[PDB]
Ligand binder design. Sequence first.
Ligand SMILES: *[C@@H]1O[C@H](CO[C@@H]2O[C@@H](C)[C@@H](O)[C@@H](O)[C@@H]2O)[C@@H](O[C@@H]2O[C@H](CO)[C@@H](O)[C@H](O)[C@H]2NC(C)=O)[C@H](O)[C@H]1NC(C)=O
Ligand SMILES: CCC[C@@H]1CC(=O)N([C@@H](CC)C(N)=O)C1
Ligand SMILES: *[C@@H]1O[C@H](CO)[C@@H](O)[C@H](O)[C@H]1NC(C)=O
Ligand SMILES: *[C@@H]1O[C@H](CO)[C@@H](O)[C@H](O)[C@H]1NC(C)=O
Lengths: 592, 420
Amino acid sequence: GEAQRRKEREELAQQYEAILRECGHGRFQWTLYFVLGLALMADGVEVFVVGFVLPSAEKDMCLSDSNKGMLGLIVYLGMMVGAFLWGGLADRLGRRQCLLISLSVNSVFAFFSSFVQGYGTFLFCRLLSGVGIGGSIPIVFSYFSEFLAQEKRGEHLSWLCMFWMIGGVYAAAMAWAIIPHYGWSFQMGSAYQFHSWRVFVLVCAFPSVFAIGALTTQPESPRFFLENGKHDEAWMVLKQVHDTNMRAKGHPERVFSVTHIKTIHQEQRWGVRALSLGGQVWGNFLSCFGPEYRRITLMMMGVWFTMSFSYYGLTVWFPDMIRHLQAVDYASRTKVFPGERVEHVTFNFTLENQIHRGGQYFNDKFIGLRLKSVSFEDSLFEECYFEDVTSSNTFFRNCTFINTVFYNTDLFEYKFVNSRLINSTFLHNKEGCPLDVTGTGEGAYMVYFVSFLGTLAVLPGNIVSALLMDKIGRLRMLAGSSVMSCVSCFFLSFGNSESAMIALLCLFGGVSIASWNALDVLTVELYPSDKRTTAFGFLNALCKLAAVLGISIFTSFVGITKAAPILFASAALALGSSLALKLPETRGQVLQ
Amino acid sequence: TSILSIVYKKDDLIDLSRYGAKINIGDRVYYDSIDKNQIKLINLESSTIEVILKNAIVYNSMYENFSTSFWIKIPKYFSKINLNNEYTIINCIENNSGWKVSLNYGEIIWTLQDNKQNIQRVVFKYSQMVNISDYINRWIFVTITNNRLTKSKIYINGRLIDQKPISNLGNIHASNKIMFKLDGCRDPRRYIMIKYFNLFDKELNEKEIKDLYDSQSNSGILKDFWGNYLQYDKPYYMLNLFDPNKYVDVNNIGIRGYMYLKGPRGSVVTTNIYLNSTLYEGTKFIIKKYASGNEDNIVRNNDRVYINVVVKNKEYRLATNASQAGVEKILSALEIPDVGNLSQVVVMKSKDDQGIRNKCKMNLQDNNGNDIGFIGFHLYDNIAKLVASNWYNRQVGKASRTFGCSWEFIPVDDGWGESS
Ligand SMILES: *[C@@H]1O[C@H](CO[C@@H]2O[C@@H](C)[C@@H](O)[C@@H](O)[C@@H]2O)[C@@H](O[C@@H]2O[C@H](CO)[C@@H](O)[C@H](O)[C@H]2NC(C)=O)[C@H](O)[C@H]1NC(C)=O
Ligand SMILES: CCC[C@@H]1CC(=O)N([C@@H](CC)C(N)=O)C1
Ligand SMILES: *[C@@H]1O[C@H](CO)[C@@H](O)[C@H](O)[C@H]1NC(C)=O
Ligand SMILES: *[C@@H]1O[C@H](CO)[C@@H](O)[C@H](O)[C@H]1NC(C)=O
């Protein structure tokens, strides 16, 4: 029984490869390449939106700690759910069908989140958008693989990763050209406010809609039709491929010589259908852990987990380290004024990064002052008057206030730490958040630039892989790029300034891309066409879970030491390369 | 049934009961100008009151039940000197045996002690961190009952607060003379107000305590936030009981303008001494007599008055157009001579139809004696606008819960000590 099924599958794969060789490479392949490139660009854009809008949403929504981190991680949680779900569903519903469904869900919820005012609703909308876009990568790669002959499969598949970098560049450019315009205050509804980061979210949800629009005009992959017992539509799709290719070539007169293609033999209602779909998906997932695929699946799991953990940890750790260095410089530039006795006089100033200690102000009226990271310590205020005072990161510690009036000030109760107020009156307090939210100004600009640089770092290595995938092999490229990634992780210690961190981030991003391309091609080529998307989606869910763990750990390791992240990344990459070197070779084989 | 009852008279304090208690008063004891029956005691040796009963009415038994009642006003405690400073205000202990009532930071304590030096203490506690307090600087009706067989109980405003068994206590002796002075107060600027001190030789139950509370409450006269009499030509700040976190404010002057509820209120803080809400915010309301024939300035029930409103230290008049859309019609503050024929007359109500005392309410009526309705607030497009409506009267007729027809008048007082 098993032998007959294996023979049928092998013969079907061989005939399919022969048909694809007969049709050739041409206009149809490039058109589908661009369509799925848009589908992948949507995914590439999706991972930057929350990170780019957090500085503004934290003030526009009164975001505290333990809520910004969840906002950051919700996209990866949504991707982890969506990758598995759509990878499981694509082997039973179709690659194009599930791609349309998931992309439409992503577009709908990304459009909805652009107008949502609350936090829990924003978290839910972003989680559902991540669920929608989670399954873009596995479905796109398995869908593009089934239209390529064995002569050039790694090259044509690795050309498909340029669009992830293009999406990253697009997100960086949109953030640079949209977010800095803080003056935009469109008003629709008195209780609601429309800022520029919502416009950024809209423009970032645009590429998923464009991808759906491009995907409406592409046919289903013939291989899914053949596996599922449908031979007429598979033959029609192959004929359409042949006609398009040969019409582009310049010979629109030859005839599709293929007549018959052997097909795999096939052997309350809503609830029954859902139960059947769940059972079949669970069966596919369990067969992925079968006697034939049990070593391969475990090694693939290890490689995906290790490389995702290391890459995501590093790519989140680099901006955090840059920010920590900038904060250290800022705190090193702080000025100190120990002791000052001040008599009756009106006070006007805008102070940045100062500490006044041991002050004694008597009958001083502070009118219209902006305070930025200004701290008063050991001070005594008597018969003072604060009017039109606005302050951020300002604290009054060990201070005593007597007969003082705070009129039209945002000096809330959390800014008076270990302070004693006697007979003091708070009048007409300005509207503000109950707790500190910090402030981000011009320093956001460079951040976008940094991200842009990182994405540009991917540009060279990709090309090399695209020019060398079929010359050396997937295993050799994977190992030889993981080794360089480990070398860069060790080299990490030779940098303590912002420029050094930028150069190191660019180097790591430019080195790991070849390994990622090889991993994608290898996981495409190592699984049969009836389990390709299920396995790819499961491995992508594992990748997203590893990304979450790595992000959490490497954020917890910022500002403590530079040895723990280096050790973790180097160990994980070494283990991943070791596990990868034992995989089987798939170059020069039919897509079986 | 009353043995001692101090009541003001012509420049003296007289016992109403048929016992002729001898009362002597110090030279630094004050009397309020409007309500001379209220007695003010300061933290001075001279500010003293002695009362002397007869030898036939001295509490000297073991099975004798007895009760005391009075009205007390205690200002706010401002600084840290006041905690852990229990000071006696009324005393009747001699040879270490008797009864006394004292005050501590947010506490009113009643103490009994017998010949065996056994202490029984019944305490009422009120916080000082509340936004709006019911006891800080406001008149409080305190009644203490003692049944030697069962319990000693305290009652604040006619409701039970604390009770403690005293059956273990032995024979309680009482002084021939009763004290009224502040003893043991370290604060040298601390004073109290007491009035209507009554003594009974039996334990009162809930019914007698309650009807005594109504009898001594003077339900026929309006009261301000502090419990004093409501007076004409005196600026009052406005507080709404239903919405106590917003103050009455105006934006424009005239018919095109409206008065609304603007918030939130400020705060007055002294770092774990008090965290009160600011009471001197908004626009002051002055009451002008129109048809009240009484010579005094006291505002009584069913008085038909005018309501001036103080905006930027200028006096305007409350008025509204009787003929506009809807029953809930907006109120406005407009110039005094230009009012013309818009409705001005407001009837002050203190007690309900049955005579049960409630808070201050204002019923706007026109020149023809037709009730425009009670004054309250209604929400128009997220603005709490002051309106005169018949809806509150309809709810009162149906015995339903009215929403926002109850107001409080807060004059500036020294016991609050807020900076304006
Ligand atoms: C805290 O203030 C109270 C009340 O004073 C008012 O509020 C102050 C903030 C300030 O604006 C004063 O001008 C106000 O009159 C003080 O208690 C009163 O103090 C005054 C002294 O000016 C005195 O004449 C009163 O008798 C005091 N009243 C009482 C009931 O004691 C209080 O002393 C202040 N606290 C401290 C530590 O100074
Ligand atoms: C710099 C390369 C790492 C990124 C991380 C990631 O998830 N990448 C996708 C590319 C479509 C992938 N699954 O390879 C590339
Ligand atoms: C300084 O004071 C003047 C007048 O008091 C005012 O116009 C100006 O705005 C103040 N400075 C700042 C920075 O607000
Ligand atoms: C500052 O705090 C210290 C204790 O931390 C205290 O001894 C000192 O008195 C404080 N300064 C002032 C001005 O009260």
